[PDB]
Every structure is written in C-alpha cells, then in structure tokens.
Design an enzyme around this catalytic site. Structure first.
Site, short mmCIF file in Angstrom:
data_model
loop_
_atom_site.label_atom_id
_atom_site.label_comp_id
_atom_site.label_asym_id
_atom_site.label_seq_id
_atom_site.Cartn_x
_atom_site.Cartn_y
_atom_site.Cartn_z
N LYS A 115 0.68 -1.08 -0.07
CA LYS A 115 0.06 -0.02 0.15
C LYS A 115 0.86 1.32 -0.03
CE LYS A 115 -1.49 -1.36 4.19
NZ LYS A 115 -1.18 -2.82 4.42
N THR A 116 2.31 1.09 -0.20
CA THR A 116 2.99 2.38 -0.34
C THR A 116 3.67 2.48 -1.69
OG1 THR A 116 3.74 1.89 2.17
CG2 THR A 116 5.08 3.33 0.83
N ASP A 149 3.27 7.89 5.29
CA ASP A 149 3.49 6.54 5.10
C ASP A 149 2.89 5.58 6.04
OD1 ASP A 149 4.34 4.13 4.21
OD2 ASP A 149 6.60 4.72 4.59
N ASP A 150 3.02 5.50 7.51
CA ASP A 150 2.37 4.58 8.29
C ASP A 150 2.00 5.40 9.37
OD1 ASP A 150 1.29 2.08 8.79
OD2 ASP A 150 3.23 1.05 8.08
N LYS A 209 -7.52 19.51 8.51
CA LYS A 209 -8.58 20.56 7.98
C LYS A 209 -8.16 22.01 7.98
CE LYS A 209 -12.03 19.33 10.85
NZ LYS A 209 -10.85 18.74 11.43
N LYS A 266 3.99 -8.97 -1.24
CA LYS A 266 5.57 -8.95 -0.62
C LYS A 266 5.83 -10.32 -0.08
CE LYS A 266 8.47 -5.71 2.13
NZ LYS A 266 8.31 -5.32 3.50
#
Ligand SMILES: Nc1ncnc2c1ncn2[C@@H]1O[C@H](COP(=O)(O)OP(=O)(O)OP(=O)(O)O)[C@@H](O)[C@H]1O
Ligand SMILES: Nc1ncnc2c1ncn2[C@@H]1O[C@H](COP(=O)(O)OP(=O)(O)OP(=O)(O)O)[C@@H](O)[C@H]1O
Ligand SMILES: Nc1ncnc2c1ncn2[C@@H]1O[C@H](COP(=O)(O)OP(=O)(O)O)[C@@H](O)[C@H]1O
Ligand SMILES: [Mg+2]
Ligand SMILES: [Mg+2]
Lengths: 524, 125
Positions: free
Chosen positions: A333-334, A387-388, A415, A492
């Site tokens: 997901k990166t 990233d995470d 926001k 992976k």
C-alpha cells in the site's frame, strides 16, 4: 520617478519595486517645500519576508542606493547575542552612534543612515512551542523620549509569525511585504542576466535556448539558477580538458572552450537538486520492483487515483482533498501511493515517513511535520504522502499506549485550508482501520480505498507468469495443487517465499515452495 | 473584516426554517446583552451533529451585531503548543476584551481545545 530596477540585478522583482516605492517612500520624492509646508513625518521601517534564497538582500541594497544614503551597516541575528549579562544591549546600542553624532552636529540637515537587520526573529520573545530585555532596548532606541529623524531600519525574516507584536505598531516597522518564488518570465530574466557575460565573449549561445532551459526549471529559486550556471561551466571545462588531453588536437580546438547544451542538460539532470521542487531519486527507493498488473483491483485503484487528481487540479469551492488507503499487511500500500503521486505531474511532491525520525521524541516529530506542511503551503500545487499513520502515533495493542500530541497535530492539520488561491492533496496509508475509527480520525478523511490480497489460483498463476521464475512443467503441478482456490497471501510475502524457495537444488524447488505456501493457510 | 470572510467561505444559504430560528435567537441574545444592568455577562453554546455548519452561523451572528470589538479564538493557530502557552493566549485574548466597553468573543471547537480522545479518556485538566 519611474525607477531603474531592471538595469542592475534584481531581475524578476519589478512589480514589488513599484509597489514598495508607491506605498511608503512618497515624501522622499517630492519638492521639500510642499512636504515641509504640510508637516508630514517619514516612515521609519519596513519588513520583508519569504522563502530563503529569493533575493531580499539585493532589494535592500538597491533601496539604499536609490535614496542616496551612506554605506549600510549590515548585522546578523545570532551574532547579536552573548552569555554574559548586559552585553547584548551594548551591541544593540552600538549601531546608532553615528546617527546620534550627526543628528547633534548637523542639526536638521544630516543624510540618511540605513541599518539592515537579518534573521530578526532570533532576538524575540514569542517562541512558545531570549532575554526579553533585548527587544525592549531595541524599541526604546528606535522610538523613545529622544527622537531620531534621519534613520531607516530594514528587517528580514523567514518565519513572519514569530515576531513580537509590539514591534509592528504604527510609528515602528509598519510596511510589510512578501518576495515569493519566481515564475517563468522571471526565470528567463535571471538566467539571461547571469549568462550575459559569457555570451559577451561569444563562447555560449551555441544552440542553447534560454527559454528551453527556463521551462525545464519548474520551481527553482533564485540562487539555484546561478548554481546551475556555475556547475554547467565547470563540467564543460573539465570535459574539454580531459578530451584535449586524450587526443593531440590542433590548437584550433585547444583554444575553444565552448560550453554546450548537453552540459546544461546533464548538470540539470544530475547536479542541482531543488529544495522546494520534485525529487526523482527517492521514488525508486520505494517502488523498487515496479508495478506488475496481476488483476483488476490494481487498475481500479489507479483509475480512482487519477480521478481524484483530476478533481483536485481544476475545481473551485473545494481546495483541499484527502484520501486513505487501507488493507491487510504485506499488501503493498506504499508503492501504489507513490505511483499515484508520481503520475500527477505536480511541481511539489514530498513523502513524509518515520524512517527519518528514529529516536525522536513527540515534539520533534510535531516540528518536522509542521515544517513539511509549511513548505507545502509555498507553492501553487502540492502533494504530501504520509507513510504509516500507525507508527507515527507510536501505537501498541497492550495498554493501549500512544502519543496524544502528534494525533492532535494531525487532526488539526488535516482540516486547514492553504493561503488564498492554492490547492493541496493528501494521501495517507495504514493497515489498522478499526483503531483509527475508534479514535475519530477516519471521520476527517474525505474518502477511503481498499487494497485486497490474492484470493484465486488463477491470479497467483498469472502473477508467477508475469514475474517469470518458474517453468511450464512446474507450473502445471502448481496449478493443479492451487486449483483448490483456498489462498490468502500478500505480494511481498509471495516474493519472499519465491526467493526462499529458489535457494536449493533444481530438484526440490517445487516441493519446498508448495510446502511453504501450504503452511501459510490463512483464513480471514 | 478578514476573519469573517475567511470562515464564511461560500456564504449563508436559506435551505429551510431552522436557519431563521437560529439567527433570530442570536439577535435576541445580542439585544439582551446590549441593554441591561443586572446581567452584564452572557454566554451561549451552539451544538449539533458534525458537518452541520456550526462555525459559519456563529461567525455570522458575531458579524451582524455591530459591536466595536470582535475576536475569534480558533485552535488552528495553536499547533504544537504546550498547555501553558494555550492558557496564556486565552487569557491574553480575554484580557484584551476586558479593556473595551462592548465586546464579543467566539470560542471555536471546544473539544479540540481540551485534547479529547474517547480512548482513555485523556484530556488537559
Ligand atoms: N501491483 C503491485 N502493487 C504493489 N506493489 C507491487 C506490485 N507489483 C510488485 N510490487 C512490489 O511490491 C512491493 C510493495 O510492497 P510495500 O513495501 O509497499 O508493502 P507495504 O504495504 O508497505 O508493507 P507494510 O505495510 O507491511 O509496510 C514493492 O517492492 C513493489 O515493487
Ligand atoms: N445555511 C448555512 N449554514 C451554515 N453554513 C452554510 C450554510 N450555507 C452554506 N454554508 C457553508 O457551509 C460551510 C460551513 O461548514 P463548517 O466548516 O462551519 O462546518 P463545521 O460544523 O465547522 O464542521 P466541523 O464542526 O466538523 O469543523 C461554509 O462553507 C458555509 O459557507
Ligand atoms: N532576482 C534575482 N536576480 C538575480 N539574482 C538573484 C535574484 N534573487 C536572488 N539572486 C541571487 O541569489 C543571491 C542573493 O540571495 P540573497 O539576496 O542573499 O537572499 P537571502 O538573503 O534570502 O538568502 C545572489 O547570488 C543573487 O545572484
Ligand atoms: Mg507501510
Ligand atoms: Mg468547527
């Protein structure tokens, strides 16, 4: 009356010059008879702020020159500070001695003296996140019981929200301004100005278009264009000397030291690295093995990213967009986020992550994130990647335990609208949706996307085919055994398993790989 | 005249009756605080579901009062602050408000000022 800026340096700041002369120095360009007959006092300070290395000192020196004033007395912020008691005050007071002397002797006919402060934010008491007496002394000297009428103080700062309020009232520094990043026309002008001597000796312009070099530099600042010119010159000289030493050329080319277009384009590609612009050398550090299409979901995700990019680029009534990618671990997901960011052609792309904060406390992380967003706010288009989000918060299932300050900082920053007339895009990434839902964060994000795993034998077979690490005979047995459709693996992890299986003799490869895959019989 | 235009981005639309009721109640409270002697301090709180637009209506009510002093203490100007800095800033704003003869202060997003999080709970006492 109409000024002479463009002739000497200060290539790209004509409009700023016209505005500043119109706004403040109106009484210095008038027949003194009427000005005295009216009885109006002059301005006693101005302030300039903006990104570093954009040409503020040149403007100050030109302003000093135009008014026909004495030599400026430059000063730097950190230099005016000491550990002993009552020493900084002496340094501050030491500047106005000549002004006092000429105010006394000549009376009311002395000339202007201009002082030029730098990094004025250093000596200030607003750092709530300094010897307050220092700013008190400065204010007492600039405006006090005794009046000075032949002075002009010019300030400079990179952070304009750390300045003490009392130093910005009428009668003190009271005319602000902003020198921003240049644009195309400006870039052509700066480049022509810097290159105008080399072409004087007709050793440049050999099929090197300045406009071409100009549209190549997207978000370059002032000094970096000059750096590019310098580096191109040096690289061309080195190439020429090496080539001439290699071959016994006649004196004709031995004298020729011409610089080439290929030098300007290689130095740009490999030597200069912008500070507010894109950066190609870090994408490869994330999408290493590349994107391989193993099913429809990849296409769906990429199309959705394209749609969001198109939505954010051209629009109104919505200048801030957000999105979150969620999925099980080891789903990749990166890489997808990096690809989506790259395919947008935005000028300013950045990737925050925890890899560059090892051992940092919470406060340092807050400061770093704030600085990254501040940098992002100084451009017409932006794209920031987180990233995470789980590791930034320092989460651990036991407890639970984490840091509240970083969470509040992120919630506030997700926001906040940019300054007027600019757009922004944010792309997050996490593997724990439920915890974020419990913490109210997911309510802030505008949208969400799902990144699934492999779930069918045909998908795994196609992935193996595309990767190209097994032959037809083995593929037959693999298909026969995986026809059961009971598979739950990440890409992976699949790569890791394949590389683990490829280590033994050519006889037991299939059996070992099948055993390892079977062991990982997960079940959502 | 920049904060009010900064917060009311796309104006105020009349999509129903409730808007009128809210505006009328705000007007009545303003009128009360203008003319009275035994009630020199008044307070009011606007509450509702999220994404309902509760920072635009408050700003409009403040603007339409024609008071000579108005300030908005939002939490987005205090990113990365420690508790003591927050307390000092709030005290500064209120103290400045005390020195006039007719004022109105807006406190926005209370729960974000306390650093509330349902887990725990945790907040700044
Ligand atoms: N279609 C694809 N999508 C994503 N990654 C792919 C694809 N094909 C190959 N890859 C490779 O998979 C890797 C992506 O894994 P990545 O490091 O992003 O996992 P991750 O989600 O960050 O893991 P974790 O969440 O545990 O940190 C990259 O090496 C990438 O080249
Ligand atoms: N009748 C209306 N009342 C309120 N806002 C309206 C109205 N018509 C249009 N708007 C617009 O709606 C937006 C108000 O949303 P606002 O930001 O106040 O939501 P919010 O309640 O603050 O959300 P949150 O509390 O989660 O921050 C503004 O763009 C405003 O111009
Ligand atoms: N508009 C400009 N035209 C030409 N050169 C410029 C311009 N702006 C900056 N430079 C170059 O950058 C340097 C000046 O930067 P400076 O004024 O010291 O900025 P700062 O003080 O913000 O670091 C010089 O090398 C100058 O040639
Ligand atoms: Mg990750
Ligand atoms: Mg709100």
């Amino acid at each position: 009356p109409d000024w002479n800026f463009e002739k000497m340096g200060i290539g790209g700041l004509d409009k700023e010059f016209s505005d500043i002369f119109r706004r403040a120095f109106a009484s210095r360009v008038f027949p003194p008879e009427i000005v005295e007959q009216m009885g109006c006092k002059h301005v006693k300070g101005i302030l300039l702020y903006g990104p570093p290395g954009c040409g503020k000192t040149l403007l100050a020196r030109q302003i000093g020159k135009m008014l026909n004033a004495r030599e400026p007395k430059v000063v730097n912020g950190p230099e005016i500070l000491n550990k002993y008691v009552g020493e900084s005050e002496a340094n501050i007071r030491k500047l106005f001695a000549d002004a006092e002397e000429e105010q006394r002797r000549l009376g009311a006919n002395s000339g202007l003296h201009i002082i030029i402060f730098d990094e004025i934010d250093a000596i200030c008491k607003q750092r709530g996140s300094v010897h307050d007496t220092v700013v008190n002394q400065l204010l007492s000297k600039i405006d006090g019981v005794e009046q000075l009428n032949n002075i002009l103080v010019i300030g400079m700062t990179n952070r304009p929200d750390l300045i003490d309020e009392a130093l910005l009232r009428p009668g003190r520094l009271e005319v602000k301004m902003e020198i921003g990043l240049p644009d195309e026309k400006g870039r052509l002008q700066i480049l022509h100005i810097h290159t105008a001597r080399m072409r004087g000796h007709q050793l440049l312009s050999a099929d090197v278009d300045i406009k071409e070099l100009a549209v190549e530099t997207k978000n370059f600042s002032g000094a970096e264009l000059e750096g590019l010119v310098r580096a191109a010159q040096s690289t061309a000289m080195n190439r020429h000397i090496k080539a001439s030493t290699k071959v016994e050329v006649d004196m004709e080319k031995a004298e020729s030291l011409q610089v080439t277009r290929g030098d300007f384009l290689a130095s740009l590609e490999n030597d200069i690295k912008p500070a507010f612009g894109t950066n190609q050398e870090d994408y490869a550090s994330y999408i290493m093995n590349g994107i391989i299409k193993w099913g429809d979901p990849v296409t769906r995700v990429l199309d959705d990213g394209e749609l969001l990019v198109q939505q954010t680029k051209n629009s109104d009534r919505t200048p801030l967009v957000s999105v979150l990618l969620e999925g099980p671990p080891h789903s990749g997901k990166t890489a997808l986020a990096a690809k989506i960011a790259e395919e947008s052609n935005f000028p300013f792309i950045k990737i925050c992550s925890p890899d560059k904060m090892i051992g940092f406390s919470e406060t340092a992380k807050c400061q770093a994130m704030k600085k990254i967003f501040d940098d992002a706010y100084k451009s017409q288009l932006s794209c920031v990647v987180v990233d995470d989000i789980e590791r930034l918060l320092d989460y651990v299932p036991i407890g639970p335990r984490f840091s509240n300050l970083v969470l509040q900082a992120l919630l506030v920053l997700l926001k906040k609208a940019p300054p007027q007339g600019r757009k922004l895009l944010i792309i997050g990434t996490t593997s724990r949706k439920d915890v974020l839902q419990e913490m109210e964060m997911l309510n802030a994000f505008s949208t969400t996307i799902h990144v699934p795993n492999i779930a069918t034998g045909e998908q795994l077979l196609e992935a193996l085919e595309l990767l190209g690490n097994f032959k037809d005979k083995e593929r037959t047995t693999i298909a026969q055994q995986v026809k059961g459709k009971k598979v739950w693996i990440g890409i992976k992890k699949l790569l890791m398993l394949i590389e683990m299986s490829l280590q033994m003799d050519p006889e037991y490869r299939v059996r070992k790989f099948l055993a390892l895959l079977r062991e990982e019989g997960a079940s959502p």
